[PDB]
Amino acid sequence: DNVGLPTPRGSGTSGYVQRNLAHLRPRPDPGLLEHDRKREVEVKVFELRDKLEEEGVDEEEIESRCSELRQKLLAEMERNKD
């Protein structure tokens, strides 16, 4: 509201400033599903690997079981894709 007349001394105005109160104020990808199924199969494989590691089983048998589980999960996904 700093508008007009730095001093009223020069003019014969006495510059009382007003607000001008008559102024108008403003008025799905199937690839994502395939990736989710692959992630679920990988999560199942990781859970099986963690269960094998918790039981103290050998690494080769755990790897073979994980490969068999991954193949079974892929076959199940291919069978139940429809």
Binding site: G10, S11, G12, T13
Partner: protein, 97 residues
Amino acid sequence: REAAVSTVNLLDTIVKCETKIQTRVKIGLNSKMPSRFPPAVFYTPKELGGLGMLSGSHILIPASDKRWCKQTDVGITHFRAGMSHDEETLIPNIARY
């Protein structure tokens, strides 16, 4: 005309020049007292003895300069225009005419 009413610098110049003309009139009387020279001194038409000045400014006429008394056979009666009206009439703008 309408180009003149829309120029702020021109309106400021008109206000200052009208003030300078009235200041010349006041200096001719060795005074600059604002109460000594009401708007009736300048803007009364020449027929009533006034100066007959026209205004392009916006000048208030106070309610203090709105009273007149008359001595009739029953005594003194003070008449007043604008009974209980807190607004003041303004000097007309020439651009409106």
